[PDB]
Ligand binder design. Sequence first.
Ligand SMILES: [K+]
Ligand SMILES: [K+]
Lengths: 178, 177, 551, 551, 137, 137
Amino acid sequence: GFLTEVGEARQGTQQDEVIIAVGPAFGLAQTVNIVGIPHKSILREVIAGIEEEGIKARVIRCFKSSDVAFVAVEGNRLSGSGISIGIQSKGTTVIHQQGLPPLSNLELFPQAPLLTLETYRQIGKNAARYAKRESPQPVPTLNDQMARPKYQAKSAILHIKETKYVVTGKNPQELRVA
Amino acid sequence: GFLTEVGEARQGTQQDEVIIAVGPAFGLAQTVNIVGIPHKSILREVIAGIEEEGIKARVIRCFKSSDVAFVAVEGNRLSGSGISIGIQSKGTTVIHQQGLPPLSNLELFPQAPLLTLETYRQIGKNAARYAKRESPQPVPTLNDQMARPKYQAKSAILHIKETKYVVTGKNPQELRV
Amino acid sequence: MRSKRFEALAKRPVNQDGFVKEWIEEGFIAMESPNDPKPSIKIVNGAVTELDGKPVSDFDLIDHFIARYGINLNRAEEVMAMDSVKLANMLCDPNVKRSEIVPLTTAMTPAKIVEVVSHMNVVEMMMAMQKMRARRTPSQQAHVTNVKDNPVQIAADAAEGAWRGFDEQETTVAVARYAPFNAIALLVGSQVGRPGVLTQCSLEEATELKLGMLGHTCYAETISVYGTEPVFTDGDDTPWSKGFLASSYASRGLKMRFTSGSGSEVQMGYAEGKSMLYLEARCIYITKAAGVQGLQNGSVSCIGVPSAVPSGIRAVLAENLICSSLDLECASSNDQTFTHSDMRRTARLLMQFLPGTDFISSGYSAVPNYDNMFAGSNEDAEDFDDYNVIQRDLKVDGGLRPVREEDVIAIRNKAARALQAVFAGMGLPPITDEEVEAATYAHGSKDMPERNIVEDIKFAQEIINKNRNGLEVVKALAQGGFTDVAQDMLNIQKAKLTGDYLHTSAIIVGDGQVLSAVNDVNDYAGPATGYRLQGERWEEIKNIPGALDPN
Amino acid sequence: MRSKRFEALAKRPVNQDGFVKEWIEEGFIAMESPNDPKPSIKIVNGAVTELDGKPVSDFDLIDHFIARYGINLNRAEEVMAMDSVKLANMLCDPNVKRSEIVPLTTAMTPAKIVEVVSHMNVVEMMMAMQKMRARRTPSQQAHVTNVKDNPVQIAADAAEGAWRGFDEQETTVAVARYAPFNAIALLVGSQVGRPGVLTQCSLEEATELKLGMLGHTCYAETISVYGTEPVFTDGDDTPWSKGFLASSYASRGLKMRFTSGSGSEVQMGYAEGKSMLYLEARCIYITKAAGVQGLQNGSVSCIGVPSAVPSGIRAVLAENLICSSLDLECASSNDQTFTHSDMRRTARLLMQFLPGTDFISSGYSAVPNYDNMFAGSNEDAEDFDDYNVIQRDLKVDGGLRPVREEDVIAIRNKAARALQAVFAGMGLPPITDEEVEAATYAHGSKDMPERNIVEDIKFAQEIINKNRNGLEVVKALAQGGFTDVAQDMLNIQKAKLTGDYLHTSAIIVGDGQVLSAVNDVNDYAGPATGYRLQGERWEEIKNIPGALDPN
Amino acid sequence: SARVSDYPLANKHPEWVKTATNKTLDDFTLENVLSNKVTAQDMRITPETLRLQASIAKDAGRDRLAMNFERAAELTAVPDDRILEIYNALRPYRSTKEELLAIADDLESRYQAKICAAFVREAATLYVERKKLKGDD
Amino acid sequence: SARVSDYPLANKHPEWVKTATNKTLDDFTLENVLSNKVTAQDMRITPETLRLQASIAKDAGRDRLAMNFERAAELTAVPDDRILEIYNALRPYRSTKEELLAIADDLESRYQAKICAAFVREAATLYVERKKLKGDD
Ligand SMILES: [K+]
Ligand SMILES: [K+]
């Protein structure tokens, strides 16, 4: 229970933060990603890479879609810096930006099983750089032709389960982290 | 060019030999087995194995069929021991003996690409060993599931060629090596 | 004590694949689900009041699109009343002409034609597919990608693939902003390999359309549709936006197809309790209704979803058969990894390979799978020889051929050199002779010098922001010593003016000769009829490396 | 400078296989050779005077046998006059019943039916095979051997085999003197695994029948015939000696089939300039003429001959189809290695697995290929998981099933024990308790304590020398406390007394229930008819190891 | 009215194919490209060509394909950036009902793209019903 | 004459079956085996059983198979080693014509195997012509 909903998030007013937007079942019905990394550790590394760069990390839970693009979009809307990080419970991550089409992004991590706690901290790091307007070099690509054979059905199932917590029309809740 | 014709062979009459009957191209239109072990080397190694057991070694070339079992059968009738060795140009080899049905044998080496001169020597000896009516342990099996995939087409071609030298009703000429 | 037998088995690669028990309430069932709707249609005053159980009052956007534009209402009542078993028999009967069947199938509802093909086993489906395939001649499509977005390597890999037989080639980007370079490299190398090969660069929808408008692609394929309303919505489209997009590509004279595939609605969280096959049929009817000529399907990137459940690979063949039966071009997947086992992936591919489809694969990887930016294909460049041998073993035209190393080296080299001149001529970050050489002899990006990515992407982006169009590539080639190649490039731009290759299954062969289902009519009537591997093409297929003269 | 793409390809396993360019003159061509004789037949007063271009004056023994006994002369002229293309169409047409076709195909000359099926592609052949297969239910046959001719292992394996689903199992020997031991191990173990499983031990002709006269086997298969007269003679037989033998087996109440297969004549030096398929057709007619119920073909042991040349694997499926079209049981090979590549051998096997034959494989190795005394099979024990997954993927009944470790370990234990009891109960080289346990968890002979093979080779020749019959085995069983197996082994001998399993395709299932073409009639008429995988068997095929519940 | 017999237009009737700027197929040569005697803006398929292809599709038994080509013929008149604006306006939650009808009215009055205008009005109606307008997510 | 509807005999008409010492299928139990109330001469298929299967084969459209079983039925009278002798005599180069006609005659008069006897005579004639008699190699 390291996540407390503290109220409907409001838009940021300065380019001094990055929003981390998580799925409606993040740290709740699901508590690890597809390869067992705890959600607790994931948020901690993302938050550290951000803070690492002299930028604030703000966390919200999104409800209107469990799609990671749209989760991120919900975050970039509110991000005072316009930059957001969307994360599904299964671990899939995206760095998004106020202004881009929902299915466009700054950086995408479309193979969750290959992500480590290190990747996660690098991702926050770069989101902060984007927020600062530096043009960071992309977090290096992770690819593996067997990730789908090994994990795509499990991915499908973890997404079906998180998707049951979607609430149409419900605004994002800012999150208190333990 | 190691085997000289030398008159049509005949019966032994004594259990103190071992006949080596080769197909109608062995050392002739074909000079090595399927993997390149020259005809000279292989013969020499089986002859070696025969005598080391104390057996006399004869050598004849057969002409009536290119089939290794019948080639060996042709000499099992000429061998005073009743035991013989049939060896095709491509290399396949069998340990035969009078009284056995022709497609039966004492020991068969059905995968020629797996025969080494080690193996060829060891055969002469089991051939000598049976001949004294000794009960040799059978030469340890060599089985490679990829032997056919690599060499069967080649085997077919080498046999198609050795077969052009088959001569109906012709008798096994003796052989001076 | 553990069985040594079961311990060996446990080690087999197939046991690393994901398998799941069927989950019917969530649509995690490939076909024949008890939740699928019984086929039905009611029509009043020329408008559908009920479709496959559902009253018009509950229609979602997909139901509406399909009921209004997807079905021949004039004969729907007649065909609904026909026996689905008889109809499936007609599909595989060699003596029932494709032209007698399409008037019926295009009058079926989605649930009806699913009920029909569900009566079939895969042998019957294959017997049917060789007949229902729209183009008489089967073809093939390849992926040309690499981990580095190296343009040199893309042009060389593209010319090799064109030389080996691919009539369509598809690239995409590891780094989004590289897109214009990949597209131009793919197009140039393809033209060097065989003039007429069509190229696409799969991107974000708006981005890809803009790129086509600039002249750097020949067609678009990954124009997605989805089989439930919530999933379509998360896919950021509706049938009307995608139907408008289709017409937008045609208004610029560009060929396009939609993409779909069993298992996508499961993967994206809303199957609405329906089987994959049934939801895929809705996608096939959204394609038909939009007036799109063709479709990439057969699970495509979600292949891990049907493959995990019973009869999923049968289901994959079934959705391709439904696509062809509904008189759409079928680019039949076989482009995405779902297994660690060679035996298993081979069974999956033969379903389309043996009968032949418009594109047997919609993305054979023409690079080693480490360089495949669609996360791996079902076949890759290291399978080229096996594919050729199987063609030769079965006397099946798989659309590819054996090729000589010296020919491939020269073609790759010429493609690298042509692109060198393009880059020099257009003021892009140079391509060095060293780079030309590596691309020549490369297997993949592991063999290529690292490029200055910042410089590339800045010039790639200026192509887009300054609208540097396709004729700039033509000119650079002409002025840079590559007149032949420039002519071929201009010729493929000219195809965009006539609308000829917009038709069902169009490819471009020989000397700029369009070949589609309109002029290359499938006329299967059983043994010794229809397309047959024979003559010179058979000779070409038979000449594998390793086959020495018995004499 | 080498291309690294080609260096990568040159390393692929498929490039280790043997391939050759066709050699027409020496019959090194799988089918469709211009040397093959044009179909013809001339009949005078009910006897053949001309057969396929040859006058009776020039007939060889094979011609005589086929002309006098192998063709239905009542419709021979009528069928000869029919168009071959039209007859090929009838073959794959779902709506032309098998029963309508059999009276015509059995009236065709060998060249006529070769001409007919040569009009077909593999998809049509498969569509045809599923209809023409004599038994409604497809089945499977396994190899049970080891390089040491270890009897204790053989029983263990035999038992696993039967439990997995094989309905026939075959043993053989590296050392011919070993023969009686293997036979009895396979027999006992097979009945332990499943009572009704039929067993054979493949040896020299005269030796095998003796074995069968003794009661140590339940059927024979490797009763060879050949397609040219010189080759048949080096095979040490004629059509009449093999026909005599066939009836000899029947007179002792033993089921048997002949064995043939494309490429044997080439391998044995005299193809008489004809294609492999035409010569195999002659072999299939020899079988039919002899009144033998069934045939093992699809190249079988000479598979590296048709596989080395174009359209060879298609020729293999075609020889199977002729077999079934001639109303013979078809045990369709898929039992011998021809390639280093898993992709390739999977394509070769699907040709029979997809439609189904009487025996999809006529010797799946139920041991790892190192232990396979037929010099390796196209499938081995390490493929069991793959084979089950593909059945589930395609909804195809491949005749086997997913099984439990527990169960297997149990099964193999009860068999080595049996044989153990058996083995001492006849006063043979006892089976050591260390031998019994090893074999319970072995995967292969590599896991087995070496044995005394000249002790055993003495006793083994003894059984046959001192004509020790199968009652001696029945006695040591029950008298070892093995009620069932002695019993079950009696019910086998009972089936021998009734003659019911002598018929086309007979196997024995459930409670000694014979399943043959006579009582398990293939009634295929297109979709939703004929054998359909469903019910419990489908449940059984779906329940594979590793499937996770979604929950 | 074009039939299957008239396909391919580039082989059977190349002169039927002209561009917006009235250039001919044969006008597109390396030399005219190099002299800029033709440019990108000359290389555009015409509504004429698309309606001929529509006619051939109909003749080939493909009525909805033809209808796609008829929409395309209208859209040749719409500038690239407007095409992209209208495509985007049709995606979920982008637009209000009124904005869609304004696009439809504009398509019709400015471009005479009456089939596309009906298409957009259709969407607006159903988007209301299925809640895919701005503010419905 | 037995018919397809008569098959399998074991299920439909087990009383039609019996043995080389005549009993019934019921009787082949392990008890009798131990007690030797049942032995190997009680467990040989009979000619009668094989003629029934021949008629069924005929009914099932398989005339050659029937012919097979009718020869089988005759060969039940020939002793095991004599079967082997005769099989071996019919192999290439094993016999003289004279020798084969003796077997035939023997088959007919000693065992009434009229079909097999005709079978052997046939072989003898053809062996002369295609030269597979002893000494023909
Ligand atoms: K594709
Ligand atoms: K077998």
